[PDB]
Amino acid sequence: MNIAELYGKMGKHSWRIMDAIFKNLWDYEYVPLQLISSHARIGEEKARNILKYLSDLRVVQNRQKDYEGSTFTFIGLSLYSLHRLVRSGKVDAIGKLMGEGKESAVFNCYSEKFGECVVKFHKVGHTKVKEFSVLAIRSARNEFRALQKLQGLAVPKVYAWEGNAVLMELIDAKELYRVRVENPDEVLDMILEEVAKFYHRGIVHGDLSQYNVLVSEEGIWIIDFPQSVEVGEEGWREILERDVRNIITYFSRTYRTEKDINSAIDRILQE
Ligand SMILES: Nc1ncnc2c1ncn2[C@@H]1O[C@H](COP(=O)(O)OP(=O)(O)OP(=O)(O)O)[C@@H](O)[C@H]1O
Ligand SMILES: [Mn+2]
Ligand SMILES: [Mn+2]
Numbered sequence: 001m002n003i004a005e006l007y008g009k010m011g012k013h014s015w016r017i018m019d020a021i022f023k024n025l026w027d028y029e030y031v032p033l034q035l036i037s038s039h040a041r042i043g044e045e046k047a048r049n050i051l052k053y054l055s056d057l058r059v060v061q062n063r064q065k066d067y068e069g070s071t072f073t074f075i076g077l078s079l080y081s082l083h084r085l086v087r088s089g090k091v092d093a094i095g096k097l098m099g100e101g102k103e104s105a106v107f108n109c110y111s112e113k114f115g116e117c118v119v120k121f122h123k124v125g126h127t128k129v130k131e132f133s134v135l136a137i138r139s140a141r142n143e144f145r146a147l148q149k150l151q152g153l154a155v156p157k158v159y160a161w162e163g164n165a166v167l168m169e170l171i172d173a174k175e176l177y178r179v180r181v182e183n184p185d186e187v188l189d190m191i192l193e194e195v196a197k198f199y200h201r202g203i204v205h206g207d208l209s210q211y212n213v214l215v216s217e218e219g220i221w222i223i224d225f226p227q228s229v230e231v232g233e234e235g236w237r238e239i240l241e242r243d244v245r246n247i248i249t250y251f252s253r254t255y256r257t258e259k260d261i262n263s264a265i266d267r268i269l270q271e
Contacts, residue, residue, distance in 0.1 A: 014053075025071075081140075122226060140161055153201075176211075181255075248261050
């Protein structure tokens with residue numbers, strides 16, 4: 001279904017059931033029916049009926065293998081997170097899907113307070129044994145905190161975070177990947193200067209690339225922070241080096257810009 005239509009099918013008991021799942025995600029991936037029922041203050045038979053219908057609408061996934069338990073689907077977690085944004089008065093209407101990939105779905109929306117914005121719903125974690133709701137939620141929260149810390153720099157203004165959703169400014173600009181520039185050396189230098197300012201604020205982007213820089217005749221913006229780290233966190237320096245190396249390499253291949261990677265890293269790091 002489309003997200004606005006899905007929202008309109010939800011009654012107050014539906015939201016209560018979703019609240020109950022959300023508040024127990026830290027303890028269980030599949031929240032047991034008994035806990036959903038007791039938290040929602042809804043009888044178990046009724047609770048089960050609501051969860052069946054929510055599964056039919058692709059909002060929850062129910063499993064029975066070891067016990068009767070439920071969790072959100074991506075659609076469901078996004079819907080619930082949207083509901084939190086609406087209830088907090090930060091969003092008035094969800095609008096059209098802007099784009100969706102393996103990592104997120106980004107929707108247009110309108111806010112009386114914030115104007116025409118975007119809400120980005122996080123699909124995946126961006127995190128130990130090296131071999132999903134709490135991880136998508138952690139991605140959203142980390143992105144929100146990074147954007148807060150960087151306010152006043154060339155990033156979107158950030159407005160709210162709930163669940164897997166981050167509400168922020170719509171940037172009218174396209175990915176660098178898609179835009180041929182005639183002053184590539186200047187554009188690269190502006191990106192590197194922004195990286196330096198992030199670092200001064202104690203933030204490393206962690207996925208700097210041609211897909212995460214937006215450009216217009218007006219300037220550049222940098223987006224996409226769920227994988228960001230604080231300076232001091234394990235591997236932060238190598239992660240920063242990678243950001244600098246990757247963006248320089250992009251410019252090297254695309255424009256044959258000559259920029260020394262080691263010097264660029266050292267300049268950033270010294271002050
Ligand atoms: N504030 C915004 N303004 C305009 N377009 C945006 C904005 N945020 C995201 N987009 C568009 O949506 C696309 C996907 O967003 P983004 O790169 O932030 O996340 P992602 O890589 O899909 O997922 P994740 O959050 O897990 O990294 C962007 O490449 C961009 O084109
Ligand atoms: Mn991205
Ligand atoms: Mn990403």
